[PDB]
Amino acid sequence: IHLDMSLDDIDSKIQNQLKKLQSPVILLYCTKEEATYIFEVAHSVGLTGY
Amino acid sequence: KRHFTRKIQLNATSVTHRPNAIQMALSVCEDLISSQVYAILVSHPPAPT
Amino acid sequence: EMEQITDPPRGCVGNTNIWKTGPLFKRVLMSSKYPDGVTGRIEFNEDGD
Amino acid sequence: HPNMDIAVILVGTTEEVAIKDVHEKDDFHHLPVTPRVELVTMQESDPKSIITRICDLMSDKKVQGVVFGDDTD
Secondary structure, X not given: OXXXXXXXXXXXXXXXXXXXXXXXXXXXXXXXXXXXXXXXXXXXXOOOOO | OOOOOOOOOOOOOOOXXXXXXXXXXXXXXXXXXXXXXXXXXXXXXXXXX | OOOOOOOOOOOOOOOOOOOOOOHXXXXXXXXXXXXXXXXXXXXXXXXXX | OOEEEEEEEEEOOOOOOHHXXXXXXXXXXXXXXXXXXXXXXXXXXXXXXXXXXXXXXXXXXXXXXXXXXXXXX
């Protein structure tokens, strides 16, 4: 997944794009701060869980 | 003139190209950012290297 | 027409932080609808081209 | 005489102090060309500040190498 926050829909597009995923092991790559935002979003998505 | 001037206003700032590589960017941190530009335009110089 | 926008950082000095306002300016600017122009029709692709 | 000109910088809260001096003492070591070092630190590091300082240092030091270090994240 390649995504960036653009205008007012990055969250929509990112959320729609991230929601599909089901995989157990995730490699993440981004700036540290972006990691903060992506993780908040993952916590909402439920991707951080066990 | 054409756009609403009561609500918002437009002011213009611009710089002559500098031969030294450093001035174009340095022209930005103080020259192009001290003034708080909302956007920048850029064009090829008369002499091109 | 958009709202709640913070001014850009004043001066390079002392600011290690990005500016929340600005990406949005790009978004509206890419979606501008003033097709009439001397140069020709204006619309912007995803890359901003 | 025959020594290379070098510069190193430290930034942020952390202080090198005596450790840098020890390195210089440690640094003479064994060699034919000797390092000549000028040290400067800056409490604050900026794109304009950092860019400015190293070149300014170029004017007096005229160093052929630079090492940069920071407390920053």
